[PDB]
Amino acid sequence: RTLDLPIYVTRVKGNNVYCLDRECRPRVLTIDPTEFKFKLALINRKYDEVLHMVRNAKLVGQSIIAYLQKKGYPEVALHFVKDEKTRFSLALECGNIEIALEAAKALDDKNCWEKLGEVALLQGNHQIVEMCYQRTKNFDK
Amino acid sequence: DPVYAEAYVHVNQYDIVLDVLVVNQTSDTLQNCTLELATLGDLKLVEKPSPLTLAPHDFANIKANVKVA
Amino acid sequence: ASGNASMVNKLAEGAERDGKNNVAFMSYFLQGKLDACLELLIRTGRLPEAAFLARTYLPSQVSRVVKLWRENLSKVNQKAAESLADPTEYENLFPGLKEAF
């Protein structure tokens, strides 16, 4: 759940959440945990929750960086993710090469490709990789 | 508030850029206040997305570029 | 242009000298020497590629080599990244029975 100007967490009184900036700038709070559910949930692959919440950041400065940067599944990608550029970043970060494929189609930042087909190969499929390279002018290759 | 705005700074290549989430989970493009420009250091802040609504239940990206030299 | 092995041995020696991977290969080939091509790869870290040769014209290093490549991959864990089989399963190597030996 998000704060409300300065607050400090003092400690936790039950579910009816309580928060303090020091002695004012205060909360009673309907909760909304994140994480707990999550590394357990995650640990059991489970998404249902997040999803269900429809909770969806990954950036605030960043926010993918707990371990969503050091990703845990691309199932994560699925809860949230955006622009082809962003998507692309994911395409490396996850290595989401599904998103890459399209991403690629949509990339056209060469270098980007340029590494990537190999990488793609590296991960698999040269049947495809050949194409990738085909426009890439690694003709000789 | 519903409107929750969360923000952090990203400094992406020279440019210190302001990620802002103003999320207006508001019950409407609630009216918004005011913002002011300024000379800064070897930088100057330099952008504001113009509107001042806090669109209902809605999330927004407000970007501030800063001028980094 | 006239062609020559002898030139090639001395040159091979040279080939070793030159410092970019690629020429040396042609040589190795040119001589006819898978072995040489493959050894060369070991130094450069040509690994995916080395596997193709090792497969195509079979010195069955595909088995040997694949394990190592896979190991790198392995280092960079994820099961898909690991990737596994030689005679049977994922690959059926000698059970496939097809065109390089």
Swiss-Prot record, chain A:
Segments passing through the bilayer: none
Compartments (UniProt record): Cytoplasm; Golgi apparatus membrane; Cytoplasmic vesicle, COPI-coated vesicle membrane
Taxonomy, superkingdom: Eukaryota
Residues the record lists as Phosphothreonine modifications: 30
Protein purpose: The coatomer is a cytosolic protein complex that binds to dilysine motifs and reversibly associates with Golgi non-clathrin-coated vesicles, which further mediate biosynthetic protein transport from the ER, via the Golgi up to the trans Golgi network. Coatomer complex is required for budding from Golgi membranes, and is essential for the retrograde Golgi-to-ER transport of dilysine-tagged proteins. Xenin stimulates exocrine pancreatic secretion. It inhibits pentagastrin-stimulated secretion of acid, to induce exocrine pancreatic secretion and to affect small and large intestinal motility. In the gut, xenin interacts with the neurotensin receptor.
Assembly behavior: Oligomeric complex that consists of at least the alpha, beta, beta', gamma, delta, epsilon and zeta subunits. Interacts with SCYL1. Interacts with JAGN1. Interacts with TMEM41B. Interacts with SVEP1. Probably interacts with PEX11A.
Name under which the protein is recorded: Coatomer subunit alpha
Residues of the full protein shown: 562 to 702 of 1224
UniProtKB/Swiss-Prot annotation, chain B:
Places the protein is found: Cytoplasm; Golgi apparatus membrane; Cytoplasmic vesicle, COPI-coated vesicle membrane; Cell membrane
Record-annotated disulphide pairs: none
Highest taxon listed in the record's lineage: Eukaryota
Tissue and organ distribution: Predominantly expressed in the upper one-third of the oxyntic mucosa and in most regions of the pyloric mucosa. Ubiquitously expressed including platelet, liver, heart, spleen, lung and kidney.
Extra information: Brefeldin A induces dissociation from the Golgi of the beta-COP and presumably the other coatomer subunits.
Known partners and oligomeric status: Oligomeric complex that consists of at least the alpha, beta, beta', gamma, delta, epsilon and zeta subunits. Interacts with CAPN8. Interacts with SCYL1 and PRKCE. Interacts with COPG1. Interacts with ARF1 (myristoylated); this interaction is required for binding of COPB1 to Golgi membranes. Interacts (via trunk domain) with ARF1 (via switch I region); the interaction is direct. Interacts with KCNK2 (via N-terminus); this interaction increases the channel-mediated whole cell currents and promotes plasma membrane expression of KCNK2. Interacts with STX17. Interacts with TMEM115.
Biological function: The coatomer is a cytosolic protein complex that binds to dilysine motifs and reversibly associates with Golgi non-clathrin-coated vesicles, which further mediate biosynthetic protein transport from the ER, via the Golgi up to the trans Golgi network. Coatomer complex is required for budding from Golgi membranes, and is essential for the retrograde Golgi-to-ER transport of dilysine-tagged proteins.
Protein name, per record: Coatomer subunit beta
Organism of origin: Mus musculus (Mouse)
UniProtKB/Swiss-Prot annotation, chain C:
Protein family membership: Belongs to the WD repeat COPB2 family.
Protein name stated in the entry: Coatomer subunit beta'
Known partners and oligomeric status: Oligomeric complex that consists of at least the alpha, beta, beta', gamma, delta, epsilon and zeta subunits. Probably interacts with PEX11A. Interacts with SCYL1. Interacts with JAGN1.
Name of the gene: Copb2
Effect of deleting the gene: The knockout of the gene results in early embryonic lethality with no viable embryos recovered at 12.5 dpc.
WD repeats: 42-79
Full protein stretch here: 705 to 805 of 905
Function, as annotated: The coatomer is a cytosolic protein complex that binds to dilysine motifs and reversibly associates with Golgi non-clathrin-coated vesicles, which further mediate biosynthetic protein transport from the ER, via the Golgi up to the trans Golgi network. Coatomer complex is required for budding from Golgi membranes, and is essential for the retrograde Golgi-to-ER transport of dilysine-tagged proteins.
Intracellular or extracellular location(s): Cytoplasm, Cytosol; Golgi apparatus membrane; Cytoplasmic vesicle, COPI-coated vesicle membrane
Domain of life: Eukaryota
